[PDB]
């Protein structure tokens, strides 16, 4: 090995309790204002990054959420389910407007291409 760069210790300061099932996503908005999280309670909850306040719950998924990404180019949030559905959420209406159908069993990661309109 060579010379570890020194990095400051990491410390804890939140526990946000409010999912009614395991949490298995986080993504942070491009704006750095809020992050989304998705849970085994099939609900997506949007949290405010500084205050930790909760300010949405989005109840579209059918059985479990576990992928969330916030697009760095569009006002959209994408999410993927163990219910075999990938959904697009429109962050100007908080409703769902796209479904991507073809997965044959549980989705468990998604990524949003940094410069193409491709998911």
């Amino acid at each position: 090995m060579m010379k570890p760069k020194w990095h400051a210790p990491w410390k804890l300061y939140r526990v946000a309790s409010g999912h009614t099932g395991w949490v298995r996503a986080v993504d942070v908005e491009p704006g750095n204002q809020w992050f989304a999280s998705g849970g085994a309670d099939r609900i997506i909850k949007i949290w405010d990054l500084a205050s930790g306040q909760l300010k949405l719950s989005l109840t579209g998924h059918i059985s479990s959420v576990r992928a969330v990404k916030v697009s760095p180019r569009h006002p959209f949030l994408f999410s993927g389910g163990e219910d075999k559905q990938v959904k697009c959420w429109d962050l100007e209406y908080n409703k769902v407007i796209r479904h991507y159908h073809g997965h044959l069993s549980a989705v468990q990661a998604l990524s949003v291409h940094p410069s193409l309109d491709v998911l």
């Binding site: 804890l12 309790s17 300010k55 719950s57 100007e92």
Partner: protein, 35 residues
């Protein structure tokens, strides 16, 4: 009367840490994330 069993010790770490129980949403579902 059967009551409670749990939290207080971890709430001592709560002296260090900000614990939020957050069962309802701070804005209605019509608030659009500002178009």
């Amino acid at each position: 009367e059967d009551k409670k069993y749990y939290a207080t010790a971890l709430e001592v770490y709560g002296e260090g840490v900000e614990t939020l129980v957050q069962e309802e949403d701070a804005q209605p579902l019509t608030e659009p994330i500002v178009k």
